[PDB]
Design a protein around this ligand. Structure first.
Ligand SMILES: *[C@@H]1O[C@H](CO)[C@@H](O[C@@H]2O[C@H](CO)[C@@H](O)[C@H](O)[C@H]2NC(C)=O)[C@H](O)[C@H]1NC(C)=O
Ligand SMILES: *[C@@H]1O[C@H](CO)[C@@H](O[C@@H]2O[C@H](CO)[C@@H](O)[C@H](O)[C@H]2NC(C)=O)[C@H](O)[C@H]1NC(C)=O
Ligand SMILES: *[C@@H]1O[C@H](CO)[C@@H](O[C@@H]2O[C@H](CO)[C@@H](O)[C@H](O)[C@H]2NC(C)=O)[C@H](O)[C@H]1NC(C)=O
Ligand SMILES: *[C@@H]1O[C@H](CO)[C@@H](O[C@@H]2O[C@H](CO)[C@@H](O)[C@H](O)[C@H]2NC(C)=O)[C@H](O)[C@H]1NC(C)=O
Ligand SMILES: *[C@@H]1O[C@H](CO)[C@@H](O[C@@H]2O[C@H](CO)[C@@H](O)[C@H](O)[C@H]2NC(C)=O)[C@H](O)[C@H]1NC(C)=O
Ligand SMILES: CC(=O)N[C@@H]1[C@@H](O)[C@H](O)[C@@H](CO)O[C@H]1O
Ligand SMILES: *[C@@H]1O[C@H](CO)[C@@H](O)[C@H](O)[C@H]1NC(C)=O
Ligand SMILES: *[C@@H]1O[C@H](CO)[C@@H](O)[C@H](O)[C@H]1NC(C)=O
Ligand SMILES: *[C@@H]1O[C@H](CO)[C@@H](O)[C@H](O)[C@H]1NC(C)=O
Lengths: 251, 91, 241, 49, 49
């Protein structure tokens, strides 16, 4: 199921899947709105497809210059081969024909060399695009800013003329609030560290929350582990660590 | 002087240094968060423990050896400083 | 007038590039240095002609005294007014100087690298996000070119047999030109195959688009149109020509 | 110059290629260094643990 | 004759400069990737950083 897949993506970027399951409508609305705004962004701004347009323009300019190089004398009497053939006898027109041949061959060699250089550039771009397909479309990449700015969730390929378009869906934190944090808390002379999150304080109490989303929880022995005593960690604070087994024994 | 001229780069060395300083300040004060969205402040030992957690080492290892780690980091930076000042073929 | 210390026998000096840099007057023991007459490129800075017809001219690598008149490290700038402010770079002039059309006339200024910020760093404070957004961005990557083939027999010689006979004396230049072009042409198809043909089978979406509220109508193929392309793909193919 | 004009548009091609290289240099530098959106500053108190 | 020789030399210089610029562009792309994946985040790629 797609919501479960997107929950797997959220787990991949470091957010618990309940954040997705409890915000499924909001996430779906955000995704739909972003997809809709992609159309406006592409239509309004014609400079995004400038890469493909510039490739086409460069190739067209190269071909046009190659064609226009045929009207040059290159030191000969005239650019037209029939004109120089008819005007002068072969034994004397041979040197002019040789001059034209040298000029045209040099122009063709220049065009071919530029074509090889540009083709190497395009091959580098195509290798990059294939890597992006494999690592962002057929997977979920943890490489930073490789599949969009943010935390990559997924991306969708779209074909373009002589190119490819990637729609990188990313997770971006929005509203931050400052807290007070401690590296560890020690309850009975034993330092406790957060098992998979961070210790935060809203001003009076101390909670443990996941690092990428403010979802506070009571500090217990199930989300913390014990290592050492109070005397080693710099910045350790005092707090009570809840033990769920104690109420069970009492009752 | 034979029609051979050099155009100055668009970004001066001061601007490149300003970018580098901005990247340094962002990394030191906010970790990897600033490269993904808004910059979220975090104490440097805590994000160092995050890095240790990311390479497979528990946070307690860093917290219980914090001074040794800081000394090793400072010594390594000083050694890079000295090596750059000594060897001219590094660049 | 130059202070170069010629030996009593030397007549004309030279630089490190073997260029005549100084000469001795045949009628006077004075030493004269030779300097090329000031030259440089001329760059014209302009917004779109649909915006305004006013332009600014940049004279490259020359001081303003050798040519409202602003002296930049990239050359002398004429027609642009220097401004103490700083904005994003609109028209890059060089050496940290940019130009733009603002309230109207052309202005010159030092580019702004960004918005100043100072993360409120302390040793026991952390910022944690209470919300999030889903951001979709667009990345465009060229994948291929147009395959072009050129024949020497008709390009170099316009259906002339004598020209072809004379061209035959040059060996195998044109055979290897055609070989290189064919290599490029095959390379382009290899590029496209490497990018797109990464899937073993042709997968199909179910006839019921019930994905938990997520809506992929803009990226899924459009069946109504004769071309089975998504609306985004239709926009992409219409824009690019 | 008059005799060079008979060789075609070699100058246009060469100057265009050199200008493309020159613009590509600034593009490279911008890609490498301008990745940051805002100019962050380290706090005056250098208490980094 | 002088024009032909100097034009050939200029073309050779421009072609080699294009190749060199391509190499430098590859290096700058690598440097941009290194900045993004090791200054803006922690990399798990082996020997990349
Ligand atoms: C920090 O969070 C705790 C939540 O555990 C707050 O404690 C509750 O505060 C509300 C007031 O909105 C009371 O109605 C509850 O009875 C409190 N419960 C407990 C267990 O204390 C605390 O007020 C918060 N502190 C600040 C400064 O916001
Ligand atoms: C956390 O609690 C412990 C125990 O209540 C505190 O330890 C006290 O430290 C002071 C300062 O040296 C001593 O005078 C007391 O005798 C200690 N108490 C005991 C029972 O040994 C500790 O200080 C608290 N944490 C902080 C940061 O103050
Ligand atoms: C781990 O290695 C570090 C070295 O990086 C040790 O720290 C050194 O310990 C010696 C004592 O033999 C001191 O003389 C040095 O000054 C220490 N160096 C630093 C940078 O603090 C550390 O003792 C080792 N720990 C273990 C458990 O082997
Ligand atoms: C997180 O941000 C979203 C915006 O993407 C908030 O959803 C908006 O809530 C307001 C309520 O004042 C509505 O008017 C908007 O229509 C909502 N937007 C969307 C796209 O649904 C959401 O409330 C925020 N979360 C919290 C806890 O405040
Ligand atoms: C997916 O989004 C499209 C919009 O792109 C929805 O199509 C819209 O449908 C409403 C109501 O049927 C119309 O008023 C709009 O004019 C439509 N817009 C377009 C561009 O066609 C589509 O209904 C959505 N899918 C689902 C299942 O709701
Ligand atoms: C998200 C938030 O409230 N951040 C604030 C910041 O605006 C303020 O400048 C700082 C004071 O040092 O405290 C923190
Ligand atoms: C933080 O700094 C304050 C004063 O700057 C100091 O009193 C406190 O002990 C420090 N705590 C940590 C964990 O560094
Ligand atoms: C050459 O003649 C001119 C005028 O007749 C005189 O001014 C100059 O000093 C003479 N130089 C030498 C070297 O005789
Ligand atoms: C001003 O012109 C002089 C030559 O007249 C030149 O030497 C100098 O470098 C110029 N100033 C600047 C800042 O370039």
């Amino acid at each position: 199921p797609f919501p479960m897949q997107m929950a797997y993506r959220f787990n991949g970027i470091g957010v618990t899947q309940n954040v997705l399951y409890e915000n499924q409508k909001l996430i779906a609305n955000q995704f739909n709105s972003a997809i809709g705004k992609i159309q406006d962004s592409l239509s309004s701004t014609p400079s995004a497809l400038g890469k493909l347009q510039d490739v086409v323009n460069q190739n067209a300019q190269a071909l046009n210059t190659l064609v226009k190089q045929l009207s040059s004398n290159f030191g000969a009497i005239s650019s037209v081969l029939n004109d120089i053939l008819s005007r002068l006898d072969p034994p004397e027109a041979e040197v002019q024909i040789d001059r034209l041949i040298t000029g045209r061959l040099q122009s063709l060699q220049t065009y071919v060399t530029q074509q090889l250089i540009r083709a190497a550039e395009i091959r580098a771009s195509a290798n990059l695009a294939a890597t992006k397909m494999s690592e962002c479309v057929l997977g979920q990449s943890k490489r930073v800013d490789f599949c969009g700015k943010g935390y990559h969730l997924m991306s969708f390929p779209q074909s373009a003329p002589h190119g490819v378009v990637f729609l990188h869906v990313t997770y971006v934190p929005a509203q931050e609030k400052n807290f007070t944090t401690a590296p560890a808390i020690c309850h009975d002379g034993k330092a406790h560290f957060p098992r998979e999150g961070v210790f935060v304080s809203n001003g009076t109490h101390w909670f443990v929350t996941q690092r990428n989303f403010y979802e506070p929880q009571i500090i217990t022995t199930d989300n913390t582990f014990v290592s050492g005593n109070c005397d080693v960690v710099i910045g350790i604070v005092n707090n009570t660590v809840y033990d769920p087994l104690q109420p069970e024994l009492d009752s | 002087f034979n029609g051979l001229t050099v155009l100055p780069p668009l970004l001066t060395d001061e601007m490149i240094a300003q970018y580098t300083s901005a990247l340094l300040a962002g990394t030191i004060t906010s970790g990897w968060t600033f490269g993904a969205g808004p910059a979220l402040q975090i104490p440097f030992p805590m994000q160092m423990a995050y890095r240790f957690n990311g390479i497979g080492v528990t946070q307690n290892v860093l917290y219980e050896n914090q001074k040794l780690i800081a000394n090793q980091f400072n010594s390594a930076i000083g050694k890079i400083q000295d090596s750059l000042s000594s060897t001219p073929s590094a660049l | 007038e130059s202070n170069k210390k010629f030996l009593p026998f030397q007549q004309f000096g030279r630089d490190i590039a073997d260029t005549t840099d100084a000469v001795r007057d045949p009628q006077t023991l004075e030493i004269l240095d030779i300097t090329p007459c000031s030259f440089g490129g001329v760059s014209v800075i302009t917004p779109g002609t649909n915006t305004s017809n006013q332009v600014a001219v940049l004279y490259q690598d020359v001081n303003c005294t050798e040519v409202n008149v602003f002296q930049t490290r990239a050359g002398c700038l004429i027609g642009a007014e220097h401004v103490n402010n700083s904005y994003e770079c609109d028209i890059p002039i060089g050496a940290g100087i940019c130009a733009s059309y603002q309230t109207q006339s052309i202005i010159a200024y030092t580019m702004s690298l960004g918005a100043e910020n100072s993360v409120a760093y302390s040793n026991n404070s952390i910022a944690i996000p209470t919300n999030f957004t889903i951001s979709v961005t667009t990345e465009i990557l060229p994948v291929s070119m147009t395959k072009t083939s050129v024949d020497c027999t008709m390009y170099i010689c316009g259906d002339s047999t004598e020209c072809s006979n004379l061209l035959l004396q040059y060996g195998s230049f044109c055979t290897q030109l055609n070989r290189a072009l064919t290599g490029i042409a095959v390379e382009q198809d290899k590029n496209t195959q490497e990018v797109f043909a990464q899937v073993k089978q042709i997968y199909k979406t179910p006839p019921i688009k019930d994905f938990g509220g997520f809506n992929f109508s803009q990226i899924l193929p459009d069946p109504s149109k004769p071309s089975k392309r998504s609306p985004i793909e239709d926009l992409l193919f219409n824009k690019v020509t």
